[PDB]
Swiss-Prot record, chain A:
The keyword Acetylation applies. The modification N-acetylserine is found at S2. Part of the 26S proteasome. Associates with the nuclear pore complex (NPC)-associated TREX-2 complex and the COP9 signalosome. Interacts with CSN12 and THP3. Present with 5590 molecules/cell in log phase SD medium. This is 26S proteasome complex subunit SEM1. InterPro entries: DSS1_SEM1 (IPR007834). Keywords: Acetylation, Phosphoprotein, Proteasome, Transcription. The modification Phosphoserine is found at S12. Belongs to the DSS1/SEM1 family.
Curated annotation (Swiss-Prot), chain B:
It comes from Saccharomyces cerevisiae (strain ATCC 204508 / S288c). Residues 204-376 form the PCI domain. TPR repeats lie at residues 112-145. PROSITE patterns: PCI, TPR, TPR_REGION. GO terms for biological process: proteasome-mediated ubiquitin-dependent protein catabolic process; ubiquitin-dependent protein catabolic process. This is 26S proteasome regulatory subunit RPN7.
UniProtKB/Swiss-Prot annotation, chain C:
The chain holds residues 164 to 217 of 434 of the full protein. Component of the lid subcomplex of the 19S proteasome regulatory particle complex (also named PA700 complex). The 26S proteasome consists of a 20S proteasome core and two 19S regulatory subunits. N-acetylated by NAT1. This is 26S proteasome regulatory subunit RPN6. It comes from the Eukaryota. Belongs to the proteasome subunit S9 family.
Amino acid sequence: MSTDVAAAQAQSKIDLTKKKNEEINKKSLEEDDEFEDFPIDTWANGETIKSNAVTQTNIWEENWDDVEVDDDFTNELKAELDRYKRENQ
Amino acid sequence: RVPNYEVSEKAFLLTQSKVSIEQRKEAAEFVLAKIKEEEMAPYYKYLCEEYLVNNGQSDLEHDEKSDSLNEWIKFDQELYNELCKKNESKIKELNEKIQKLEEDDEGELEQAQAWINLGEYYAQIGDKDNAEKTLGKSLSKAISTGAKIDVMLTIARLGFFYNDQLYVKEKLEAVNSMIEKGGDWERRNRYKTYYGIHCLAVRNFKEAAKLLVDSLATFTSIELTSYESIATYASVTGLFTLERTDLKSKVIDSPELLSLISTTAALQSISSLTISLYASDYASYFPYLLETYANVLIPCKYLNRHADFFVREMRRKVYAQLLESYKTLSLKSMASAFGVSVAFLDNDLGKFIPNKQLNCVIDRVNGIVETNRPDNKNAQYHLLVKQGDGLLTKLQKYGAAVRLT
Amino acid sequence: EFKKLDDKPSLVDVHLLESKVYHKLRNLAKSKASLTAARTAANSIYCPTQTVAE
């Protein structure tokens, strides 16, 4: 979310009357939220959500298995392939 | 109580197209029989959605794909008619009983027992929302502490039906409050398993093992899945968590598993895998590992999303064990034991090493596999500095905030 | 059902066979449990020499 623990820095900082003005001033420097452009260009986004479920849309602990496919299918072939060569060597 | 999960278990297996041809067509039979007989009518419409891109579909009112690999899937109009009839009927009967309990005072115990029956029907038909409402009135009338705990578990179970992990999680906070109010060890075992299954449903298994190895000894089951089913889940969670010395005690030398034997496929494959990790028969390890993918990980609801992670881990452990006993190996010896090729072996090591649990390098040139050891005082130094780096970050971070105030 | 009709030392042998069953199912947690119950039915002094040898 943000650097460090994102959860530790959200409660450290919350709204006061002093603070509210500074939020608007910061926003207005670049202008907007900068979070309306992505919905317009794509006209409804199409993220990486297909590969698995530890992807971009994730709300549970990551498994780290989106950088790599399932090699178990491959292994089924590799195992059998070895048996056949081995047998006549 | 009994169809509520058993129909969902088979219906999940039926959804997949990444199962065996044979296993999907066996499941499909149990699901279909139970819709007609038990009046699972609304969840059956729901289930037509849940394929969609996966095959099997052959429904008369709901989408079909071009490839029907199943035919123990049909929508009939009789199902719909039935619904309408049965619905009004059950509703009408109990209502009148509730009014009767109002006229002559009896409504503390009996009206809540009527509303328990209403949520079980609601639950039967696959409505989490309206089951829960009825199970809400049951609370308000003052009943035993035992009854109150039993009800919350039932509601959390309806969370498992739609495979919504958050819906389980939220309800099981409330049981944690009442459990010590009743103070039962009976409904605490149920709690241990209820939680068991919930912890198994999410990524992290560390909690799961602990609850589920215990659930072998003493189990009490009210709307909680079979004892052979619970045994299978426990062997999975044992493997993940524990290493040799501990592992051997817990899940091979349990009296409970040893009296239950193996008679079914699922239990059998998982069990044989576990002894082979201990016993350093690595040959027979990979046939068992492959069996574990098809028959154990994937048809399970609570491991469909953790199947990929579990097998990858398994490959990491077994090779890492071998490495602990070696300083040098050869490429061919190592490959032969597994029953793979040297070329294929280098390839599987080369995904696993960067992330590292193996702690090895490979000299492709001298033809050895060499093993580096950072376990000494060096290891313990690296452990501490990192844990300390975080304490330094947190101290800084809160401190800037108060110094600003 | 024969434990309300507990009077026979021929219940020694039934506990002994239950012990043998758990022995080859290879759990000795439960093996001991039925062995205790075998010594309890054979605490009666009217048991044959052969059953005690067992």
